[PDB]
Ligand binder design. Structure first.
Ligand SMILES: *C(=N)[C@H](C[C@@H]1CCNC1=O)NC(=O)[C@H](CC(C)C)NC(=O)c1ccc(-c2ccc(OC)cc2)cc1F
Ligand SMILES: *C(=N)[C@H](C[C@@H]1CCNC1=O)NC(=O)[C@H](CC(C)C)NC(=O)c1ccc(-c2ccc(OC)cc2)cc1F
Lengths: 300, 300
């Protein structure tokens, strides 16, 4: 079978804390003696329309920030604002700090999200950074500060912090340095993301996973060229395929014996003729939230 | 938004161990001073066709079972066979045993699976016990012994241990007492599950979640009766709806203002007229892997 898998969230659960400022409570990430949380924790419902985060932060001191690590309070001995993230220096280093790094991911890359509320883990799911720098997640009120991460061996790769929801229902956020993904800003205004396109290289990797798992009806026999396929990809709002993407799908194409351009022609036929009621790996649509890495990781 | 969420797997990761017997290695569950693992760990490739698990277990002693807790070995001071599970008594109680209980779940109930290989967690995903007592999971070789669980507050509810894969690609396993879900046996023979039906009450809960999340095109205006709806449900291989299922969907029907029989008629229209290319919560099919509990948990 083939399923959407999230990373084990054990190493991240021990880093989630509750951060309270005034009458706003959200989640923070406790790594070493630093707590990271969205800076709009210092905002009231009034200021959220057009906040001057400077002027707002100047009127706050260390003792205005309440940090909850379960039942134990952490003492805040320093605060600073880096882009759209607030960094609270605490006197106690997190005894369960895992080996970690901060990374800024690229569009199309996937990661696991640990949805939290009041510093408590609630669930985990697998997400993908859309080409328009949004994510299609599941977030309620108070979910801000929840983190997205990847796990390589022992190391945790923090890549996302949830900040806001857009009018279309999708979600926007920053890296762990406070830099937003995309052209979004942290204020209550109608912000528009671009037209969301489909991650073509991810769809191809998913079609390869279908081949490995016995689902092989969609495999036509035509072939195509990179330029000819991309001409059709533009018409269906698909991301253009590059020779880099072709080489990335190399191992999958070598395992299944199906050339990348052969799979491109089969996708072409699926885009112009549709599913006709037939599912692929149990889905009646084309899934683009599996990277080529995710496919080989799950299939091996 | 609305996503398939798994429980945080932190409390379960600390219970996974590696169990080796001869040249067979699978995962075991280390709770207190007991290790639970599938009994076919004592099988060779020859015996798996028609094993006499008794005769096979009689020829094994305590020191034939190798238990790996990461890098540390656990000393086996007792072994016993309970149904299709093997219970290894070790001298050291797991210092990270969470508050836990063993439960046997019902068809249609959901749970999180922590896929493991060689006693190491690899990923987590959300599963559902199909009405034919199989699961549509993602399992490779060596994944046996991986556990399914639910998390209420602090307590972990272990409900599934993976054992085998069926010819159709679905998976079968036992509860933590070794009793298989369904009519399956642990030997390499072509075993057939019944015709898999759709969990009707779960589809209704998902349609309610779509209503809460603004997706409301499918809502017709007709109504129906429980007997009339069930007449159509049988024709599409849907599970029959009972008055118990109606009362379970009560809170969801009270939150959305849509009567259960009204939603039943809208599902009826979807079954006979199809999607017509329109998605619901981003899916072109009817998802039945969300219980009414899962919906209210995620929507609140
Ligand atoms: C974090 N706790 C919270 C998560 C949100 C809440 C609901 N679902 C989520 O994911 N994030 C916030 O409250 C944000 C605070 C700002 C200051 C960063 N704001 C928003 O999520 C937000 C922004 C904008 C809108 C919106 C929608 C439509 C529209 O049309 C006129 C105009 C503005 C909504 C919204 F929830
Ligand atoms: C556990 N390590 C492993 C997991 C399997 C392996 C592949 N994917 C999984 O989920 N489980 C086993 O190896 C089982 C051991 C038995 C003794 C409990 N066996 C199976 O999973 C198994 C059983 C039967 C078949 C099969 C399929 C088709 C068929 O048509 C004639 C006949 C038998 C396959 C199979 F993998």
């Amino acid at each position: 079978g083939f399923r959407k898998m999230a990373f084990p969230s054990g190493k991240v659960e021990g880093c989630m804390v509750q951060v309270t400022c005034g009458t706003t409570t959200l989640n923070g990430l406790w790594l070493d003696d630093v707590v990271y949380c969205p800076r709009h924790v210092i905002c009231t419902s009034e200021d959220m329309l057009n906040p001057n985060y400077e002027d707002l932060l100047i009127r706050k001191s260390n003792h205005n920030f309440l940090v909850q690590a379960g039942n134990v309070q952490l003492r805040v001995i320093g605060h600073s604002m880096q882009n759209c993230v607030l960094k609270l220096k605490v006197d106690t280093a997190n005894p369960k700090t895992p080996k970690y790094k901060f990374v800024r991911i690229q569009p199309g890359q996937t990661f696991s999200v640990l949805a939290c509320y009041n510093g408590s883990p609630s669930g985990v799911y697998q997400c993908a950074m859309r080409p328009n720098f949004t994510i299609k997640g599941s977030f309620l009120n108070g979910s801000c500060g929840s983190v997205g991460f990847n796990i390589d061996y022992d190391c945790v790769s923090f890549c996302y912090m949830h900040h806001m929801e857009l009018p279309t229902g999708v979600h926007a956020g920053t890296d762990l340095e406070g830099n937003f993904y995309g052209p979004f800003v942290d204020r209550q205004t109608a912000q528009a993301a671009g037209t969301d396109t489909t991650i073509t290289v991810n769809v191809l990797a998913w079609l390869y996973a279908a081949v490995i798992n016995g689902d092989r009806w969609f495999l036509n026999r035509f072939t195509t060229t990179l330029n000819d396929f991309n001409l059709v990809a533009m018409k269906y709002n698909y991301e253009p395929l590059t020779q880099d993407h072709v080489d990335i799908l190399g191992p999958l194409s070598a395992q299944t014996g199906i050339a990348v351009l052969d799979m491109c022609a089969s996708l072409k036929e699926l885009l112009q003729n549709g599913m006709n009621g037939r599912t692929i790996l149990g889905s009646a649509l084309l899934e683009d939230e599996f990277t080529p890495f995710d496919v080989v990781r799950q299939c091996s």
